[PDB]
Amino acid sequence: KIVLKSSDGESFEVEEAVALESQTIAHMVEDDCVDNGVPLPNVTSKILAKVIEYCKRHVEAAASDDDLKAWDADFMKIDQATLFELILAANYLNIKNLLDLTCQTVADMIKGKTPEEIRTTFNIKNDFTPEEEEEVRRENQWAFE
Amino acid sequence: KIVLKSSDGESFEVEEAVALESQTIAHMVEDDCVDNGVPLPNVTSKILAKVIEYCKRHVEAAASDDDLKAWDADFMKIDQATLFELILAANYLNIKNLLDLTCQTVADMIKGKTPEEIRTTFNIKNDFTPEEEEEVRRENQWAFE
Amino acid sequence: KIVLKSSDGESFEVEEAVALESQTIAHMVEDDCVDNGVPLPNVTSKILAKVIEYCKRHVEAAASDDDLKAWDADFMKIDQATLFELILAANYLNIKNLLDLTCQTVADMIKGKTPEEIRTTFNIKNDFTPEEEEEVRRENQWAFE
Amino acid sequence: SCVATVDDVIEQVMTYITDPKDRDSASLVCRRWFKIDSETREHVTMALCYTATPDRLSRRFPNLRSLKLKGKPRAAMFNLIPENWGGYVTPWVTEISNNLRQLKSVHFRRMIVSDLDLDRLAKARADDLETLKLDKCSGFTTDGLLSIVTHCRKIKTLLMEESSFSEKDGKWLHELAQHNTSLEVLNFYMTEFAKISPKDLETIARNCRSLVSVKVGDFEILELVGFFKAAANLEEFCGGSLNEDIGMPEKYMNLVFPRKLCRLGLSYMGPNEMPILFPFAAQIRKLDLLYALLETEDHCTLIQKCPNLEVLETRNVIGDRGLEVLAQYCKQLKRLRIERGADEQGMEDEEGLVSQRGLIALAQGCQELEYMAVYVSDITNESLESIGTYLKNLCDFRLVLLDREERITDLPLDNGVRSLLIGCKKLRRFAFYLRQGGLTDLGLSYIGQYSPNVRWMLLGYVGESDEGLMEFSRGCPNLQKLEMRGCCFSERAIAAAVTKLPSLRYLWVQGYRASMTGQDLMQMARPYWNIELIPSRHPAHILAYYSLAGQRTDCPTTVRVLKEPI
Amino acid sequence: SCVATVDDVIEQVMTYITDPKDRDSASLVCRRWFKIDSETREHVTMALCYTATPDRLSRRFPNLRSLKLKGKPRAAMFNLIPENWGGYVTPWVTEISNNLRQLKSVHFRRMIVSDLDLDRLAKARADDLETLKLDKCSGFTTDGLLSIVTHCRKIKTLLMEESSFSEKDGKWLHELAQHNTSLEVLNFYMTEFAKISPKDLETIARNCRSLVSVKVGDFEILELVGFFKAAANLEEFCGGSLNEDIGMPEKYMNLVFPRKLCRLGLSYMGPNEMPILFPFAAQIRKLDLLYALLETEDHCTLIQKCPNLEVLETRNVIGDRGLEVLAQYCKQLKRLRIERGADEQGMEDEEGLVSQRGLIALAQGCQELEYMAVYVSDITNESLESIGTYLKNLCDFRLVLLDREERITDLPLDNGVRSLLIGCKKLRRFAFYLRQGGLTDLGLSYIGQYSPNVRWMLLGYVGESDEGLMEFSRGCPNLQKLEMRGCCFSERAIAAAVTKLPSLRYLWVQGYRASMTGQDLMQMARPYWNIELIPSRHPAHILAYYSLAGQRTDCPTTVRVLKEPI
Amino acid sequence: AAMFNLIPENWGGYVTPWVTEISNNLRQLKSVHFRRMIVSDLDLDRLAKARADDLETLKLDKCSGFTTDGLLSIVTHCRKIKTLLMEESSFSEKDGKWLHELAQHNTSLEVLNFYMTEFAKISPKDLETIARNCRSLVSVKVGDFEILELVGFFKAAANLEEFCGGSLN
Amino acid sequence: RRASLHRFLEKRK
Amino acid sequence: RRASLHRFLEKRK
Ligand SMILES: CC[C@@H]1C[C@@H]2C(=O)CC[C@@H]2[C@@H](C(=O)N[C@@]2(C(=O)O)C[C@@H]2CC)C1
Ligand SMILES: CC[C@@H]1C[C@@H]2C(=O)CC[C@@H]2[C@@H](C(=O)N[C@@]2(C(=O)O)C[C@@H]2CC)C1
């Protein structure tokens, strides 16, 4: 049992093999700061909660796939701002399943869309001068890839 | 009564008007984060202690000067590394009284010393090319001030 | 449940996680040839049987070591020609376990023996010209290692 | 802490977008995404080296890990393009030296590569060069090969397939044998090497634990016996020479093939040596009988033993009979290529013709087919119809009808092409090469009308008049590269169809109603559009493509660049 | 499928044979095993660089990952060998450049290494050099260090212990601080650096998460306070300088030592700073008081707090009293070395002598000892007897009796050596260095008679006449390397004993009944047997060793190579 | 004072920052004379490669810190050396190939000077061959070569104006 | 007439 | 007279 202290003074009681999904929390039981609980003040407590939920479930692949892509897909039914905070968080800790999952989830939103549809569904202002856009478009279609 | 959470999980029980010496802690009772105590993770707990001690005493200028320059002077009988951390701390919070005292204390160490004596008592490597040192010395003695 | 077809037309009913010990049979559920059972015509049926027996037992480290080095040691009480066929088999599939134990078992036969004792207990004809043997012997004893 | 934006996370996410067409879009959403794509793009392919300067490439994508350049037009693979036409790799290797400091893999395809340019590549990239592919290139020698194998000590994959170079010695292979440990794939499949030693090859196998694929020249297979025992992890082997002599009736029969070999093709293999494959035929997923000396009967008997075959390449000797066999034994078949055989003295035998019979058989049996390319001796509208009805998810379909036969069952193929294009709606590449009567202007328009996903097309002897080219031209929403030979169309019609085609960026045409005038092609002069003529020294060729670079500096004398009024 | 042979499997198995002595055998079973060993051998040590050419090394073992060469004879560590004697690393680094393309680790021990030769190593091996050990080398400068730390960006272990070089600047350390991430062990333990910045060392700690061991020069320990906080994973630390001033009575006392530190030695540590160790003394498994300023009393008080101590190195100040302490508190002791102290003005104190009392106490307490090396002020046959009875599995035992004392209790040590050699039958290394009366020809024959496992021996002032050498010479079945100094034996006796010794491949002798003739040593002239003389410019030295290479090209003027009739 | 064993060997005089400056910014240098300086093999390998055929003259004059590897480096990369001097220098002599290298390829040598130096591994044959190839050879100063071994050398050095050294035994 | 098979159709005969 | 302690026995005094 390990204690994780969120970025707003919020202790979290979590199991051994759950907190170890994060190689950032694992490489921190060598020089064990665990004496005062692992201080990770970059994760919102709301987010850290969601991170632990994910790790909890995946470690329960002890009893050994089909129902996971189901829980995973349902776990990602969240809003953008929260998706992004998960990515940042998976990177901050070191959860390849999750960073590889949040990042992939954002990437899945881009895949197949056109440049307009992309900045539509992310609210991004097209700041290209028309010459720049044209050059990039020509490069992409006449020359590279 | 307000709670100040130091940069190593260390709650501090402090009076109203004491924590208000810091305009950083005062501008933080508007959007009152006080719900979970004021989170200030840039002050060592050892330092925060010393800051509160200073504020405690100065607020007791309610009973209304001579004995203050005395406590102040005695308060500053600390080591360099600790003086500097107080300056950084007074700046981090916003205690104008305290910055004018730590900064002045460091400045009093410089006053009267020669350039060699200065980098001696601060361990600073003289990185001037001899031409640069000469120009600056000439400017200082022949031209300006 | 997956079907493995041995190198003499011999179907083998084997569990999911058992057949997956072989990364050669695992990388073969992508392009799933499993439609007609995995065709592996380089393993004798006698041998494939022995391979599955080994995998069966190791997968039952679900219920979680001491008794394994026992079964392992007892599993290796076989003849040379059969030991060798197992190695070729572990390499043909891709069972790294079936390997750190069998190979180590063969290496344990070499360890400590002299060059004569080695080819004695493996029946190998010393085909060195006497100059070659001499050079190698000199290198080994005067120069290297 | 404020609301986290995509911007706080896009540097990270971009590296999970892998598809070249999604990178394309991403790079266009705004200046920042453009920059992140620019600094993280790992692989770039240039379909035509002359399309941009190397400066432009390395400015856009400074951190390429992997590059692939093509030079000469596809036509060059059929001796239609002058040897000196172009495709010089050298400005690209100097740019790699100076500015693509991250490059670990280079694939040159149909380019001129000299010894100087590979000595430069070797020295500049050294231990970082993990893969080099000289793919149908020319212009170098064994000194060049020696140079890269002594300076690039960690090469994982080295390829020379179908390249022409001067062979002065065998030390390049020997140099690999002596120091290389990391080789995974080694490929000199279609090449004349007379001075390399099979011993060296054997020693490479002994030293390269990850050696997975090797393709080779005319080595006597018997000389490779040691090689095969040592190549424990070998999965692919093509080449060698099976030379039977009546003297040893069982010359072979005792081959130890690596236990994993599942992708193979033994050159010159006859019916007498064929059986050495039977012991593991169940395992074979790729077969290359392209250079095999076996007859239509023998094909059926081997095909029959390979239930898990997903790729087959072969000559037309396979026959209708062979296709019928393939039709029900190999249900998993994904790619089939039927090259054309010895077409002089009878079709190799009196079954070595494939026709409607085989095609329609194939369509019904191998419904998983993604790639089908076939030189056919006779077709019917019915066979195209069945292709279209049964094998959806065909991605690349090519049909050429041989000129041997006098009477072709039913010729105008309009209604067949039409149902083919309608049913195989995943089609991205399409080649259709016939004889004059083959397709009418109505059918030509059908091809343009029903091929919304087709990026490349080679059209054979299609249409009857300019009407057809023009009708065709109002379609093909996504046609990027168009190759036509043996068509009647006039200069102005070609010009006008290029103008109508929304996506066209490459045009190669041989045979067309010319005019010494020249000046009719001009009616397609756009900015950035380079038109090159290879004069009638074979009938005049037209090569035209978009380029950000302007007209190539390096044209031969045989190639005339067309510019405004002479 | 036929009966599987060992041959179908030996390539795979060979890589599980790790023991150098088993590889040795395996390489000799037949041509094939020889070849597989040749291509798979990962580490090779050469105990004497002049024993083979680098060409030979890289022909036999082209894929070495790890190399270790020794040069100058051990005697060099005692200022007995001329500086210019040999041990030039340079032909080896040129061989590594060209032919040991796999090398990731180099350890040079007692060799001459120049800046040129390390610039070449750095550039040749670059990012692949994971570990470099300049171990008691000379001949380079900080330019060479800078060169390897800028080109070898991934160095995991970098060592310079006891090397001599010219220090021009501190940039090499700064260059590590700025760009190195991978450092695991950094060792400049016994070295004069006056231009490197403790700030740079601290920043290395902050950047190298796997930093486990660091040994250092005369840095003020107080200046390393930041370093220690940052070195979270530090398990070993030696060096630094503890400089007390009466001004700060508690100068130290506030040291944060990494919580894992368990192998350490603080230089100049006195009794007043000693206590900073108490807080975690239970944890200490290795102690290096070799350069400590503490007295025999203080040793006992510290030793006493270190129950888990398995390695202790110290000067003889430890005293008999200290040995007694060590005898029952530290039962797990595996290795003990008692160097000789300041032996001019009284033994540092009136307890700073170790004797039969300490030895016999030690033999009874620390029965797990594998390595014991001791400069003793007085012995008795009885103490040798107890070593032999109690501490079996001693592998390496070295005893030198100081020359300070006039009377030694009982001197002829024959019966003690005899039971010592008989009880410790695991002994591979043995040194016995006395005074003239110390051992008789009878005892000398005992050493040769009862040391079947001894590979190396350094013999001090043993024997009385040639009778002893010759009797000795009929034993020592496994003696490879023999070092004798201060012995009476004549040239012909030396020559004759060499002839008798089955295993001898290295001989160093100082002090012997010479003869300007020279020609008596000649009676051991074998093929491949190199004899070298270092003339009496100290008494004449004889160095002789087997070599496949022939006589060294690179002898100084101070060294004369002996060849047949002058 | 260093010429009289009064100055510590490690005092200073390291030539290396100067050769790196020569590499980068004195691109016209054809002659270098170092006097009482510390010269390493690295720094002469850099000099040789940086200046190569342009180095007409090198004088290592009472210098220390190098070896025959350095010498070899400069005589193989500086193929046009006119004047090469090592008088009174101390270095480590591992071999004689530097002199042999000159003998085999050098044509331009005018002055060659290792007057006050211990060389035990160089061959008088090589010196003779240099004399035979270097028509402009005007001055040579040498170590303890037996004068009799230089008889060939003297016949071949037609233009020789200066000779110092040798050994008359 | 592919350039790889034109080389073979003649090395055959 | 070891070369590591000869350096120390003098840095001591
Ligand atoms: C100038 C164009 C060439 C024209 C060439 C010609 O003479 C006939 C085809 C050949 C051509 C060709 O590519 N044939 C195919 C193939 O993949 O090789 C597509 C056909 C195979 C099914 C192209
Ligand atoms: C060639 C002999 C030298 C001679 C040196 C001399 O003066 C006596 C010993 C020393 C010798 C020696 O090896 N001493 C020991 C040690 O490991 O350093 C073994 C002794 C330690 C107890 C080396």
- The coarse silhouette of chain G is elongated
Sheet having the most strands of chain G: none
List the helices and strands of chain G in order.
H
Count every helix of chain D, treating DSSP H or I runs of 4 or more residues as helices. 18
Subunit organisation of the chains: part of a larger assembly
Q: Any idea what the CATH architecture of the largest domain in chain D is?
A: Alpha-Beta Horseshoe
Amino- and carboxy-terminal Cα gap of chain G: 17 Å
Structural class of chain D: alpha/beta
Radius of gyration of chain D equals 25 Å
Radius of gyration of chain G: 6 Å
The CATH homologous superfamily of the largest domain in chain D is named Ribonuclease Inhibitor
Q: Quote the distance from N terminus to C terminus of chain D.
A: 67 Å
Give a list of the ligands.
Answer: ligand OGK
State the largest interface.
C-E, 43 and 41 residues
Overall tally of structural domains of chain D: 2
Shape of chain D: globular
Instruction: Specify the biggest β-sheet of chain D.
Output: 21 strands, mixed
**How big a fraction of the residues of chain G is strand?**
under 5%
Count of DSSP strands of chain G: 0
CATH topology name of the largest domain in chain D, in short, is: Leucine-rich repeat, LRR (right-handed beta-alpha superhelix)
Structure classification of chain G:
mainly alpha
Give an account of the 3D structure.
Chains D, E: LRR repeats lie at residues 47-71, 72-91, 92-109, 110-143, 144-171, 172-199, 200-225, 226-253, 254-272, 273-297, 298-321, 322-357, 358-382, 383-415, 416-445, 446-467, 468-489, 490-513. Chains D, E: Pathway: Protein modification; protein ubiquitination. Chains D, E: It holds the Pfam family Transp_inhibit. Chains D, E: Jasmonate binds at residues 74, 337, 375, 398, 485. Chains D, E: One of its GO terms (cellular component) is SCF ubiquitin ligase complex. The structure is cut from a larger assembly and holds 3 copies of chain A (145 residues), 3 copies of chain D and 2 copies of chain G (13 residues). Chain A is mostly helical. Chain A has helices at 16-19, 23-26, 45-59, 68-75, 80-92, 96-110, 115-120, 130-143; strands at 2-5, 11-14, 38-39. Chain A has a single domain, classed as Potassium Channel Kv1.1, Chain A (2-Layer Sandwich), CATH 3.30.710.10. Chain A has 8 helices and 3 strands, in the order ββααβαααααα. Chain D is α/β, with parallel strands linked by helices. Chain D has 2 domains: 1-41, Monooxygenase; 42-566, Ribonuclease Inhibitor (Leucine-rich repeat, LRR (right-handed beta-alpha superhelix)). In chain D, strand 18 (456-459), helix 17 and strand 19 (481-485) form a beta-alpha-beta unit. In chain D, helix 4 packs parallel to helix 5 and helix 6 (115-125) packs parallel to helix 7 (142-151). Helices cover 62% and strands 0% of the residues of chain G. Chain G has one helix spanning 5-12. By secondary structure, chain G is mostly helical. Chain G is elongated and about 15 Å long. Chains in contact: A-B, A-D, A-E, C-D, C-E, D-E, D-G, E-F, E-H. Chains E and F meet through helix 6 and helix 7 of E and helix 2 and helix 3 of F. Bound molecules: the ligand CC[C@@H]1C[C@@H]2C(=O)CC[C@@H]2[C@@H](C(=O)N[C@@]2(C(=O)O)C[C@@H]2CC)C1 (2 copies). One copy of the ligand CC[C@@H]1C[C@@H]2C(=O)CC[C@@H]2[C@@H](C(=O)N[C@@]2(C(=O)O)C[C@@H]2CC)C1 is lined by residues 75, 78, 80, 373-375, 398, 400, 431, 433, 458, 483, 485 of chain D.
